[PDB]
Symmetry: C3
Subunit: 266 residues, 3 copies
Amino acid sequence: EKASIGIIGGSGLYDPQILTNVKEIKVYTPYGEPSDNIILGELEGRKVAFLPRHGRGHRIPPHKINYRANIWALKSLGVKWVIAVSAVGSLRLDYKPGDFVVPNQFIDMTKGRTYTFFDGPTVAHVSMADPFCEHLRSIILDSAKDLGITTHDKGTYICIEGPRFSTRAESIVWKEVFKADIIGMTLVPEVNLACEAEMCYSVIGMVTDYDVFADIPVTAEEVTKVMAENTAKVKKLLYEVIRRLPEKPDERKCSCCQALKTALVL
Amino acid sequence: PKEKASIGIIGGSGLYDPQILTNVKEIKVYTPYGEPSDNIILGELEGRKVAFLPRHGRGHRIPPHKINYRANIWALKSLGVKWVIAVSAVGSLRLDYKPGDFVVPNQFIDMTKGRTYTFFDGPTVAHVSMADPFCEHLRSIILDSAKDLGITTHDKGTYICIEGPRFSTRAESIVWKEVFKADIIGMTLVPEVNLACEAEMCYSVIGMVTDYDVFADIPVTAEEVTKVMAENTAKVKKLLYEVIRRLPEKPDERKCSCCQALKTALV
Amino acid sequence: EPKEKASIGIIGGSGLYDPQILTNVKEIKVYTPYGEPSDNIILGELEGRKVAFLPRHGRGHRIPPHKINYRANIWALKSLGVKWVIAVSAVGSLRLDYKPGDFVVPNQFIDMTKGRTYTFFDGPTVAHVSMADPFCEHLRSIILDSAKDLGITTHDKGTYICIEGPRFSTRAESIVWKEVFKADIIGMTLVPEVNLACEAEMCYSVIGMVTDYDVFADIPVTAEEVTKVMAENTAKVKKLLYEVIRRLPEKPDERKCSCCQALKTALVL
């Protein structure tokens, strides 16, 4: 009924043969219900919570995910580290399908989501100049290097509304104009909320395809396919990362861990 | 007697021409999303069953951001529509696309902000590909017809869709043109085009240039759009009817990017 | 007994309002077709000028930017007869020469908000107001003439990029707002306030108070650093504000007011 590490990804990242106290729980939140029941497990004495953002059978599209419930639920369990795993399209020929990316920045191009837990009467404006948690980013990168997994160490993730994929003119713009490196649909508001909940959050992006600006454009089908072929990789990465996580992130290396001290308008 | 049409026309009122269409009948259709912008007008043109649906409603009482896009596209699909010719007034972002010229865009950039973008809210998740958002089969027939009629029609273009209803700010417009490199601008394309694609229809818009956006003698006005529009409504109707006369029964799938959109879009 | 009236509207933070310079203070509550305004409106007189103060975030700043009832606020001022609307707002800077403590009277904006209500016209009357020059030039020049006479540093032009918030920009977003969109300042409340004021045919202008550089700077913008600096310059805007009000003609000059006759040409017939 407690966990310090939260894993938000796809189904199956859950490895039942390496996690000990499995347990499934349902948590009610002031925002309705999470994408699914949360799976609690133990890994080397580390209490972990798995929450597939699309639900177990991938029934919830990006624009319908109850992001507030998911992040709130994790927070209510005591989660401090959140490792978010996401399939992403690449906007540069050197970030190739199969490669991983641990972005350090994002650009929000979503349109009708709920972006914050603060709707009033308490107004807060969290700083997100460096939106991700550096502590978790470097452990993920350290682990990726030891495991020999190709992983770019920086990158700007442009989050679009979806569900449809980008138009070729849009994609040229994301790449040439906004200078984004990778593209997806679920980062925002997940990352905003995790920050406002003062969690140390980082995303591992798995490059599935070149976006549009390429040879044979992105299909929902090729994404699901390349994903499977690299799910095994992230599971290894994931577990190795969890094995190395200190009990709490270092505040000096966590931009959002004290986000609220300076974000409330008083 | 099941009411059917293979061709859908979405534009302004008027396009529909009383005694030009022969077996005209008005119908109201109920959809899982509420009601379409207006009753649909069914008619025949040389044995071609056609459905007209003015997206703003007959008296133009519905603004761009309030259009029930899902109801409109779902209604056309339920009637058996395969081809959808969308006609829209647009502002030009380049001195060579002039008021009076038409444009058949091949791309778009979506800058809208609070509309409903899809028919797929769950539990079936779908991510339709839109690299080439329009139906090439329809675009070329429209261009062929334009050429035969001698109607100036640019054969490509990036349509940037803004939320509106207010028109762009000069700084926005400089960005749409110099940065985004868009060619024409309007407010109703998205999500109409997303939805038509998800409904696996062959869809293409005819943009009627109405004004230069902000860089022009006097900036774009709603009155100016309505003015130049009428002056060219006559041209689109001719174009329109010529296009319909030439349409094959079904679009050629090899030339229709969305005609089989779902086979590959479901997760 | 006499109906509530004001020709000037001030929308900003609490604090601009002052008991010693506005004479017949009266607090009123106005109901609108959109619900209620961010707070009760404070009516007062300044040199025989009837003024209305409306703090857009509410007196205790309990309403965030994305939750403000912009339609109610604008409609309430309109119903009181307001013709000049001076909007005051804390903003971040996207250029090193626009410094904290400087003021800016923008002449352009770029809307990057995402889920707000942008217009009073949802049908059946469709209207597309022109906004090529979004602000009211008449008010802008009076503000600038007043700033110059008071010796208050005030940039006379600028593109305000409005973001959805409430979280502050990412460093990658800020580089894009600055290098790509070329915006000069950044804030969260301009749109749809400015759209609505224009559609109401009001002569509207914002005085932006630079509070901080945005992420491309010393150490990134914090909510707390905007609170600290704002206060240090609230005194400046109050002087500016009052001097501006002292000079306002009865009605703006339509030839110097892009939105004052906005509806004549915006309705679809």
